[PDB]
Amino acid sequence: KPIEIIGAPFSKGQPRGGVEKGPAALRKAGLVEKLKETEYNVRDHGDLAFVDVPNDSPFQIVKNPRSVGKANEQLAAVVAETQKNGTISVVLGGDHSMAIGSISGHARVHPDLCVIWVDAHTDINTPLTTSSGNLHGQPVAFLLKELKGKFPDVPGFSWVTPCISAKDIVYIGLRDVDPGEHYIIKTLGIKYFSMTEVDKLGIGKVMEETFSYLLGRKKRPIHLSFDVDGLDPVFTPATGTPVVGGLSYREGLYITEEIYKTGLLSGLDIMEVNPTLGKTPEEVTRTVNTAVALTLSCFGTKREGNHKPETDYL
Amino acid sequence: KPIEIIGAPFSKGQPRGGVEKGPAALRKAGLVEKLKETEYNVRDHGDLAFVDVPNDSPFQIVKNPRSVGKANEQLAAVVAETQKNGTISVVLGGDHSMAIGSISGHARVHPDLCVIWVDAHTDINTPLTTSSGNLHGQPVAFLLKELKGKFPDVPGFSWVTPCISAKDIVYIGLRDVDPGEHYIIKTLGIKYFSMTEVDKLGIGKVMEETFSYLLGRKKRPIHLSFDVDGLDPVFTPATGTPVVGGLSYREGLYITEEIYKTGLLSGLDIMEVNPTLGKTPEEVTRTVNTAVALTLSCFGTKREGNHKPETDYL
Amino acid sequence: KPIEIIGAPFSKGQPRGGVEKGPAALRKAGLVEKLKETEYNVRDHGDLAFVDVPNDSPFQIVKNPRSVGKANEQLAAVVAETQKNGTISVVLGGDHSMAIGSISGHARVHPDLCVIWVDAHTDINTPLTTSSGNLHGQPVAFLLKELKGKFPDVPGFSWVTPCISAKDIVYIGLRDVDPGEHYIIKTLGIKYFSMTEVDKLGIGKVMEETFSYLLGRKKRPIHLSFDVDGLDPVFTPATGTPVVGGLSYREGLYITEEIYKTGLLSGLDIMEVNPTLGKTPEEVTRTVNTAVALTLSCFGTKREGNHKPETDYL
Ligand SMILES: [Mn+2]
Ligand SMILES: [Mn+2]
Ligand SMILES: [Mn+2]
Ligand SMILES: [Mn+2]
Ligand SMILES: [Mn+2]
Ligand SMILES: [Mn+2]
């Protein structure tokens, strides 16, 4: 199978600059070369150049709508392109608003895909419910079929078509949900595993259940959108919105190893790595290294070890 | 339901001055304001002023017996008062000896209550078994019916009436038990989950079993006495007796979330926060913050989120 | 029962100097004295003085083969001696290559022993598969009967006799396995619990299965070879090969308590503690304290507490 890396050095979805440096830091850490060591064919598409929309006035509370909408339209085009050729798309953020383009493009080719969202947040604030006009906290609102017409059309997003329903998404790691968002997920009946279900069940059973929920009836492509703040700040401190009490490095790797085993991974997002938010160089290195480890894990790297087939090492 | 915060700025139960500042630090961190945002009606009763007993000579090894006994008599009077009017009492320590008064007063109104003690310690040393005369390590000895007359009467504690039996208490988090205390818990058949049972069972099953043990036959009010050293020093470093290998921030929140769900929480103690023991201001901040988080969780704050009823956020 | 402490201040099994200081650091922390407080009789045999083999030319890739072979021949003699007298041998490393003599010696007396190997690494590289000629990463290759004749004879190891088979060893904590080693364990059918099985099952069920696997049929002497890097670097940072995502302090203690409860502990190795690799004095203190705690745990110290039998504490 083929892997295509696409860097989305974008940050207008939130107020903290620096996430645009994310793809660079990940490449600098040897992400691409380490992936070539796996059984996959790797092709680096490079970073996308995002044109800045001048005079991008905020829409009500929503900041940089046009700049975010345009960058996402462009990303969706690139992703649909790679997906069409039958390759696996790996997007390196950038803030989480880029999931709009990533998932949209992916869904054009695989309309029946399901999404596993790993994040401390639901990121499902609608333009009417946000306390800040920050779009990184609103991706899922733009993708749900059930949220269509429940919020005014935003400048720059008219190309978007709600591709997935409430039945096709599962959240893992939740621990910082606004009252509005919580209202939404309860009302829509969206399956989730907050830190409390993880604590109650253990990560092993959490994965068993998300799989029987999403793949029980039909086997379909999986899109894993991974916000690095889903792990505890001790492992991924260099992020914009760290929340204590998160998934451990072990649980994170467990998630990715189980996904790899399904043989159904189709799209992957490694989002919110912000190299400029590390208090010490080691905090940055810690964050990058774990992002890299999770990516490699999605593609076969096992903790029990790996050996090349047909090679008699004796 | 109504909540009433009662501060017990007392420290004579142990040698390290500082726990008296506990209530102030917790209020300073916005505990009361954040509690008002919940569905509960909150009333801050202020801090109790304890009269110092001059010439408080030690009773054998037992230090400050009269000061501790008197402060507890006054606290018991206050708690019995609030409980009577049908409100939930929340005591902010202060060292753990104040549990004598908090639980005594609570039992005057709800004689059939049960106690869930979260601590790294059993705090069940009798005046005869203590290696130090410190009363913060002896609360439970004074409250147990099965321990009546097994130790000489102490000056200042004649008002105390053993209110709960060995069948009504469950310990969680044990990892530092003296040989004597160990002998007592084994002999009396007290249900406990030391760190090894937590490790073996997982916090989810630990809670399931404590509830089936304490509420299996009769549903009765619950008194949760929470010693902050029950959690690992990594989370609550600002305490007088930190012991490595404790409960995680996650397990602590899981305990409080499950207790909230029973609908039976009647009394709560947040003990042993000592602001002066932090090696760095961040250490004190870390400690206070988690204490606040545990309190809020007892009253409904969930990690999956919360939304006000009847409010259509769309 | 009797315990005999044997110090193995040896470091030629790997490139980083400092592990020889391991035994001194452990003794300085009061290990021997703390052991005497347990129900066991303790005899400290002191530290073995290892004769350095001049002109120890590498065997192909393999470094210091003769020095390592000789130090291990001498250690095996000592251990066979103490085991013969019916005492429990406790070896203080020193690098993990010393497990060759430690297990060899033990097996001469107890041929039916089983081995529980706690380590991040399988340490099963053969002289032909090592990327570095370091012998600390090859102990098990020399002990396995199934690996006899699969690699050339090494200068200094002619005295070694493969004592255990693939059926007698269980690995716990694996998270850094070379391709070659992974091929070997998979081919030979060796039972193991990598961090992913630990995540999936929980330390409790992991221990239940290693016991039914090794002792289900015949109860036999247990040799526990413990490499301190088996625990996460947060607990044991002063080692030569730290790998993130390891066993916690709590899981490590759980392992030792369960082993203690079997009543079959016969031999114990506490390897890889390197004092000179701590970045701050505290890091060395943290490493030493947890190694001491694990040792005392094997010999009865429980987290729920201990009380001396026949002493009425009331
Ligand atoms: Mn996100
Ligand atoms: Mn997030
Ligand atoms: Mn206490
Ligand atoms: Mn305590
Ligand atoms: Mn190792
Ligand atoms: Mn080793």
Side-chain angles (χ1 to χ4, degrees):
Chain A
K1 206 64 196 300
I3 299 315
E4 185 135 339
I5 282 63
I6 301 158
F10 190 74
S11 60
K12 282 83 167 56
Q14 40 90 71
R16 296 169 180 267
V19 269
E20 71 271 354
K21 293 188 176 60
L26 292 174
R27 282 202 188 83
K28 198 61 145 45
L31 179 54
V32 183
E33 287 69 36
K34 291 169 187 283
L35 271 179
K36 287 177 177 175
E37 289 172 50
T38 73
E39 63 184 355
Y40 290 91
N41 255 261
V42 183
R43 189 224 161 181
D44 190 350
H45 185 289
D47 287 342
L48 296 186
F50 298 112
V51 266
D52 234 317
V53 175
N55 226 25
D56 196 1
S57 23
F59 177 78
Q60 293 189 39
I61 290 183
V62 183
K63 306 178 196 155
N64 308 290
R66 295 166 205 85
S67 302
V68 172
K70 189 47 202 169
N72 271 282
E73 176 169 46
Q74 192 185 148
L75 177 57
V78 176
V79 176
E81 199 66 69
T82 81
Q83 282 291 330
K84 184 205 279 70
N85 299 309
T87 90
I88 298 175
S89 54
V90 176
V91 180
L92 312 178
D95 67 75
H96 222 165
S97 66
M98 296 314 291
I100 293 174
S102 174
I103 302 184
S104 293
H106 187 169
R108 286 176 186 155
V109 181
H110 293 113
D112 61 338
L113 63 63
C114 61
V115 178
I116 294 184
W117 196 278
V118 177
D119 200 326
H121 316 102
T122 38
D123 291 355
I124 199 169
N125 262 317
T126 68
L128 297 181
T129 61
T130 16
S131 302
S132 58
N134 305 323
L135 282 158
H136 73 129
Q138 305 177 62
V140 188
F142 290 83
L143 302 163
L144 284 186
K145 286 180 174 173
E146 291 83 356
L147 251 34
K148 182 59 166 301
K150 304 288 182 165
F151 63 89
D153 296 311
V154 184
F157 294 85
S158 41
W159 63 267
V160 175
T161 309
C163 28
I164 84 289
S165 71
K167 290 309 171 286
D168 305 312
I169 184 170
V170 165
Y171 285 105
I172 300 181
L174 307 179
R175 86 194 78 128
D176 191 18
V177 183
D178 285 343
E181 298 179 289
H182 183 251
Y183 175 73
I184 296 173
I185 71 173
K186 301 297 287 191
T187 298
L188 269 52
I190 289 173
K191 186 72 168 177
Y192 63 90
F193 291 96
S194 61
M195 287 318 300
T196 121
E197 284 65 49
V198 178
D199 289 338
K200 170 188 179 58
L201 301 169
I203 194 66
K205 183 53 186 163
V206 168
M207 294 305 301
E208 222 170 84
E209 265 191 58
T210 92
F211 290 150
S212 60
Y213 174 79
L214 298 169
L215 311 178
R217 274 189 234 22
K218 304 270 179 302
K219 270 40 180 186
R220 53 232 197 89
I222 295 169
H223 189 98
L224 164 67
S225 194
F226 208 120
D227 182 336
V228 102
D229 69 29
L231 297 196
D232 191 87
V234 141
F235 305 111
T236 52
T239 1
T241 310
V243 181
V244 303
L247 292 171
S248 60
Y249 180 93
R250 286 166 52 183
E251 290 167 319
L253 288 181
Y254 188 82
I255 288 163
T256 52
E257 283 168 347
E258 281 304 284
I259 279 165
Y260 163 80
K261 285 171 55 188
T262 69
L264 300 171
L265 181 64
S266 203
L268 198 220
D269 302 324
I270 298 300
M271 313 292 250
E272 309 279 13
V273 163
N274 185 334
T276 68
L277 293 180
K279 283 167 286 298
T280 62
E282 131 75 1
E283 294 202 332
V284 175
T285 296
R286 200 186 328 158
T287 309
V288 171
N289 288 353
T290 126
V292 171
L294 298 164
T295 302
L296 298 176
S297 172
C298 280
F299 299 111
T301 304
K302 285 179 160 59
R303 273 177 297 166
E304 77 167 42
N306 299 276
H307 70 262
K308 233 150 301 186
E310 290 179 15
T311 309
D312 180 56
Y313 293 83
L314 294 178
Chain B
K1 202 66 198 296
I3 302 310
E4 183 146 331
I5 282 64
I6 299 154
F10 191 74
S11 58
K12 283 78 167 58
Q14 39 91 76
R16 298 172 178 266
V19 266
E20 69 273 353
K21 297 189 177 56
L26 293 174
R27 284 206 190 78
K28 199 61 146 48
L31 174 62
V32 178
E33 285 70 39
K34 296 171 180 291
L35 270 177
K36 284 181 185 170
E37 299 177 46
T38 77
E39 57 182 6
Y40 289 91
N41 257 265
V42 182
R43 195 216 158 207
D44 191 353
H45 186 288
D47 290 342
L48 304 187
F50 302 115
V51 261
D52 241 308
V53 179
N55 248 353
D56 200 359
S57 310
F59 177 73
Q60 296 177 46
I61 307 182
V62 185
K63 303 173 195 156
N64 308 310
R66 293 153 209 102
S67 294
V68 174
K70 183 52 203 169
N72 274 284
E73 179 169 40
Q74 184 184 161
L75 175 59
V78 180
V79 173
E81 200 56 55
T82 81
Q83 280 293 328
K84 181 147 159 301
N85 297 306
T87 84
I88 291 173
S89 56
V90 175
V91 177
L92 299 185
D95 66 77
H96 225 165
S97 65
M98 297 311 294
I100 293 169
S102 170
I103 304 181
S104 290
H106 187 174
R108 287 181 186 151
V109 180
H110 294 108
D112 59 342
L113 56 67
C114 59
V115 171
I116 295 172
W117 197 277
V118 182
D119 202 325
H121 316 97
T122 38
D123 294 353
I124 198 169
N125 264 309
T126 71
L128 296 183
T129 65
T130 15
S131 311
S132 62
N134 300 327
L135 281 153
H136 76 120
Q138 312 172 54
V140 187
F142 293 83
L143 299 164
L144 280 189
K145 288 178 174 175
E146 289 82 2
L147 247 41
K148 183 119 189 204
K150 307 285 189 175
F151 62 93
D153 300 309
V154 185
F157 297 85
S158 19
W159 63 263
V160 178
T161 316
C163 33
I164 85 286
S165 82
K167 291 322 173 206
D168 311 312
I169 182 168
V170 169
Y171 283 106
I172 299 172
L174 308 182
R175 79 188 81 120
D176 193 23
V177 185
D178 285 345
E181 302 182 276
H182 186 249
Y183 175 74
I184 298 172
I185 68 177
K186 299 298 290 184
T187 302
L188 273 54
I190 291 164
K191 185 74 169 183
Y192 62 90
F193 294 91
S194 72
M195 292 315 303
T196 123
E197 283 64 54
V198 181
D199 286 346
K200 171 191 171 57
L201 299 176
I203 198 64
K205 187 59 188 154
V206 163
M207 291 315 299
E208 212 169 276
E209 267 190 57
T210 88
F211 293 149
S212 58
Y213 172 82
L214 298 172
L215 308 167
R217 269 196 248 84
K218 298 237 141 35
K219 298 307 174 280
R220 57 234 191 86
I222 294 173
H223 187 104
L224 164 70
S225 196
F226 213 115
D227 183 335
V228 102
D229 67 29
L231 303 201
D232 195 272
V234 137
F235 307 110
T236 42
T239 4
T241 315
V243 184
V244 298
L247 290 165
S248 60
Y249 181 91
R250 282 169 58 178
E251 294 168 309
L253 286 180
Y254 186 84
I255 284 160
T256 54
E257 283 171 349
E258 288 302 296
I259 283 165
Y260 165 81
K261 285 170 53 194
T262 62
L264 296 164
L265 180 65
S266 181
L268 198 227
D269 300 325
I270 296 297
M271 318 289 243
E272 302 285 10
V273 167
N274 187 331
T276 69
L277 293 183
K279 278 167 291 302
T280 63
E282 128 78 352
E283 290 201 335
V284 179
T285 297
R286 200 183 326 164
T287 311
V288 175
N289 283 358
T290 137
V292 173
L294 293 159
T295 310
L296 293 173
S297 173
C298 278
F299 299 112
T301 300
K302 288 174 149 61
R303 284 173 292 170
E304 71 169 53
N306 299 278
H307 76 251
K308 229 153 304 188
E310 302 175 6
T311 305
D312 184 77
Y313 294 87
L314 299 177
Chain C
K1 204 64 193 299
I3 301 308
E4 179 128 351
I5 278 62
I6 302 159
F10 190 75
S11 67
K12 283 83 164 51
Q14 41 93 70
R16 299 170 176 283
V19 253
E20 68 274 0
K21 299 190 170 56
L26 289 173
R27 285 208 187 87
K28 199 57 137 50
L31 180 53
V32 180
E33 287 70 39
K34 294 173 178 288
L35 274 173
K36 290 176 182 173
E37 293 177 66
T38 73
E39 65 193 357
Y40 288 83
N41 257 262
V42 184
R43 193 205 163 208
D44 188 351
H45 186 290
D47 288 342
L48 310 187
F50 301 106
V51 288
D52 234 307
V53 176
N55 229 18
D56 201 359
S57 305
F59 176 72
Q60 289 179 48
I61 264 198
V62 184
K63 302 180 190 113
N64 307 296
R66 296 163 205 90
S67 295
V68 169
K70 186 53 198 171
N72 273 294
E73 178 171 41
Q74 185 178 158
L75 175 61
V78 179
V79 175
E81 202 60 66
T82 84
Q83 280 295 332
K84 188 205 298 306
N85 295 316
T87 80
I88 292 177
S89 48
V90 169
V91 181
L92 306 183
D95 66 81
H96 224 166
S97 61
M98 297 313 297
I100 297 170
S102 178
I103 300 187
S104 293
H106 190 177
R108 291 175 186 149
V109 184
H110 291 112
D112 61 341
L113 63 60
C114 60
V115 181
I116 292 175
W117 197 277
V118 179
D119 198 333
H121 316 99
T122 42
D123 287 349
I124 194 165
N125 261 319
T126 72
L128 297 186
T129 65
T130 19
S131 314
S132 61
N134 305 333
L135 286 157
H136 75 124
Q138 317 177 44
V140 187
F142 295 79
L143 299 167
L144 283 192
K145 292 180 174 169
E146 287 81 6
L147 255 42
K148 188 114 171 74
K150 304 289 187 172
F151 59 92
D153 294 311
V154 188
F157 295 87
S158 31
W159 63 266
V160 179
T161 313
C163 26
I164 85 287
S165 69
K167 257 19 183 184
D168 309 308
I169 184 165
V170 165
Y171 283 102
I172 298 178
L174 305 185
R175 84 190 78 118
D176 191 24
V177 183
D178 284 344
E181 300 180 280
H182 183 259
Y183 173 74
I184 296 182
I185 71 175
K186 299 297 293 181
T187 297
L188 274 45
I190 297 169
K191 188 68 173 174
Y192 65 84
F193 293 89
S194 65
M195 294 314 299
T196 116
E197 282 67 52
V198 179
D199 289 333
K200 180 187 167 54
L201 305 171
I203 197 64
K205 183 55 182 164
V206 165
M207 292 311 295
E208 215 170 273
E209 263 182 60
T210 90
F211 290 145
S212 55
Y213 175 70
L214 298 166
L215 311 171
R217 267 177 273 153
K218 300 280 178 315
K219 274 47 188 185
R220 54 230 195 89
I222 286 174
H223 184 106
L224 169 62
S225 196
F226 212 115
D227 182 338
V228 99
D229 69 27
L231 302 197
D232 196 273
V234 146
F235 307 113
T236 46
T239 356
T241 306
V243 181
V244 298
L247 292 160
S248 60
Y249 181 90
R250 286 166 50 178
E251 288 168 314
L253 286 184
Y254 186 81
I255 288 165
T256 52
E257 294 171 344
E258 279 307 286
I259 286 177
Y260 166 79
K261 290 169 52 196
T262 70
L264 300 163
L265 177 67
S266 197
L268 202 224
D269 302 315
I270 294 299
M271 319 287 250
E272 303 287 8
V273 166
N274 186 336
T276 66
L277 293 183
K279 286 166 283 301
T280 58
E282 134 74 357
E283 293 202 338
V284 178
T285 298
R286 218 187 320 157
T287 309
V288 173
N289 287 358
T290 141
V292 173
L294 293 161
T295 309
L296 297 176
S297 181
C298 283
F299 301 110
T301 306
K302 287 175 154 68
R303 281 172 297 166
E304 71 169 44
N306 298 272
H307 74 246
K308 233 152 298 185
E310 294 168 9
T311 307
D312 180 45
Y313 290 91
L314 296 183

